[PDB]
Amino acid sequence: MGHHHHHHSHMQELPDSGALMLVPNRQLTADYFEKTWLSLKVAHQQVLPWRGEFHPDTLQMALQVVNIQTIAMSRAGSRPWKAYLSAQDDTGCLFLTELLLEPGNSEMQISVKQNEARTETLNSFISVLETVIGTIEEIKS
16 A cells, blocks of 8 residues: 655757856956946836835745845845846846836836857857746746
8 A cells, every 4th residue: 555656857958059158257246336337328127117015035045046146136125126136148248227116006027238249158148037036926837
């Protein structure tokens, strides 16, 4: 007796053809990030209605899993919740990101500005952000 069930599910995700490998590389100081942010202009800005309860701890830790370094971040319950992220791809382009969560409104505005802007790098970088944010708004996938 005792019905034992060992569910075997051996997946394997192969690296993408257009291989954008985002490394943290240089941890940018508050001073350096500030200067470089003001030195660049917002390349993309995306407005998204945040789904349900917000968790900055969960968001930050998932960003770390996808090699996105956290420059600055506000606390849970604190609005306007703003955070500054950075990354750098394997081809040496520097990425600067902002996350803004409105005072009374459940609206998150993502402001991305990289130094040498490619259409591919910008789209793929945001796609990483979409996956991180979405998986924390809706818990299943």
